[PDB]
Amino acid sequence: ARYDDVLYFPASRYPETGAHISDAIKAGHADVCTIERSGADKRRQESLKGIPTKPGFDRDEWPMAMCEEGGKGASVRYVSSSDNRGAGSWVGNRLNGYADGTRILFIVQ
């Protein structure tokens, strides 16, 4: 199998994050997150290298840094901080029901 469970991303609540994820998947970035939480700092170092900060915005990454698929090569987009921080908290809580190694297909479309 390709994935273990599916997650329908809450695009109505966090539309800017959702739009990024949708576009990134249509650009060939992985739609499955193989959860690997320990590596997330190293993966952010890699994905964000050389990308300046912008006020009012966070640098959103897809694939996410908490996934094996993240890090080097990830799509990065400036997303309003409230949208991105809300999405981040939502995802961390929702995925807290799944052990590391679980493969989650994200669907936004």
Numbering used by the authors: 34 to 142
What does the original paper state about this entry?
Here, we have characterized NucB, a biofilm-dispersing nuclease from a marine strain of Bacillus licheniformis, and present its crystal structure together with the biochemistry and a mutational analysis required to confirm its active site. When the secondary structure of the single stranded substrates were calculated, position 20 tended to occur at the boundary between predicted single and double stranded regions of the DNA. It has already been shown that BlNucB had no detectable activity against total RNA purified from the periodontitis-associated oral bacterium Veillonella parvula in comparison to the positive control, RNase A. Therefore, BlNucB is a Mn2+/Mg2+-dependent, non-specific endonuclease that can cleave both single- and double-stranded substrates, but with a preference for double stranded DNA. NucB, on the other hand, is necessary for the degradation of eDNA for the dispersal of bacterial biofilms. BlNucB diverges from this general description because glutamate replaces the histidine, and this glutamate is essential for biological activity; therefore BlNucB is the founding member of a novel subfamily of the His-Me finger nuclease superfamily.
To understand the molecular basis of its nuclease activity, the structure of BlNucB was solved by single wavelength anomalous dispersion (SAD) from the intrinsic sulphur atoms in the protein and refined to a resolution of 1.35 Å. Overall, BlNucB is a single, compact domain comprising five β-strands and three α-helices that forms a rough triangular pyramid with an approximate diameter of 25 Å. The core of the protein is formed by the five β-strands in a bipartite β-sheet, with β-strands with topological order 1, 5 and 2 separated from β-strands 3 and 4 by the β3-β4 loop that breaks the continuity of the β-sheet. The β3-β4 loop is stabilized in part by the formation of a disulphide bond between β2 residue Cys66 and the β3-β4 loop residue Cys100. Instead, the flat base of the pyramid contains a 15 Å deep, 10 Å wide, 20 Å long concave depression that is formed mostly by conserved amino acids. The base of the depression is predominantly negatively-charged, whereas the lips of the cavity are mostly positively-charged. The surface depression is of sufficient size to accommodate a single strand of DNA, presenting the scissile phosphodiester bond to the catalytic apparatus, whilst the lips of the cavity can interact with the DNA phosphate backbone. There is no metal ion bound in the apo structure of BlNucB reported here and, despite repeated attempts, we were unable to obtain diffracting crystals containing either bound divalent cations or oligodeoxynucleotides. As with other members of the His-Me finger family, BlNucB retains the metal-binding pocket, including the metal-chelator Asn117 and, as in Vvnendo, BlNucB encodes an acid (Asp93) immediately before Glu94 and located so that with minimal changes to the sidechain chi angles it can be positioned to co-ordinate directly to a bound divalent cation.
